[PDB]
Amino acid sequence: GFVCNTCPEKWINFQRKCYYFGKGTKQWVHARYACDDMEGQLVSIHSPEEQDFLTKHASHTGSWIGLRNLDLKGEFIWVDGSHVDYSNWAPGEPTARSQGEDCVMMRGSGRWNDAFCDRKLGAWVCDRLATCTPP
C-alpha cells in the first residue's frame, strides 16, 4: 500500500503533492525564494485535475507559478525541472513577440499569461511532495 497524503501545517494536499497558497505582493523571483525557503518550489502543473484544484483555491487577482522562459529562447519550462506535459495557456499565449515577458502567472480563471518578471502580484503558489504513512 503506502498512502502519500501528509502535508506540513498550512499546506493543502491534492493527490501526492502539497500546495501553499501565498499572499503578499511579490515579483516572480521574490516568490521563487519564498517557496524555496519553505522547502517548496513555485508550483508546476501536470494535469487538468491538478489545474482544477489550483483554480479552486487560486487568488482572484492572479498568482505567480513555476513556469519561466529560462533559456531565453521562447521555451517555457518548469523551474522544478519537471516535464511540460500539460498546459493551460490563455488563448494566444504565450505571445510570440513580447521580449522580456519571461515569467508566467495564473489568473483567477486559472488560465496562464506570460508577464514581465518584475511585475508585482499579490499571490504565488508553492508545492512539494506529500509524505506517506506506512500501511
Numbering used by the authors: 157 to 291
Task: Copy text verbatim from the article accompanying this structure deposition.
The S252A auxiliary binding site mutant crystallized in the same conditions and same crystal form as wild-type Ca2+-free derCD23. Similarly, Pro-250 is trans in two copies and cis in the others. As predicted from the crystal structure, the introduction of the S252A mutation did not affect Ca2+ binding, but unexpectedly, the D258A mutant was unable to bind Ca2+ even though the aspartate forms part of the apparently nonfunctioning auxiliary Ca2+-binding site. Ca2+ binding to the mutant derCD23 molecules (E249A and D270A, principal; S252A and D258A, auxiliary) was consistent with binding only to the principal site, with the exception of D258A, which showed no Ca2+ binding.
The second principal receptor for IgE, CD23, is a type II transmembrane glycoprotein with a C-type lectin-like domain (CTLD)4 (3, 4). In its membrane-bound form, CD23 consists of three CTLD “heads” connected to the membrane via a trimeric α-helical coiled-coil “stalk”. The interaction between CD23 and IgE is critical in the regulation of IgE synthesis, which can be up- or down-regulated depending on the oligomerization state of CD23 (2, 9, 10). We have determined the crystal structures of the human lectin-like head domain of CD23 in its Ca2+-free and Ca2+-bound forms, as well as the crystal structure of the Ca2+-bound head domain of CD23 in complex with a subfragment of IgE-Fc consisting of the dimer of Cϵ3 and Cϵ4 domains (Fcϵ3-4).
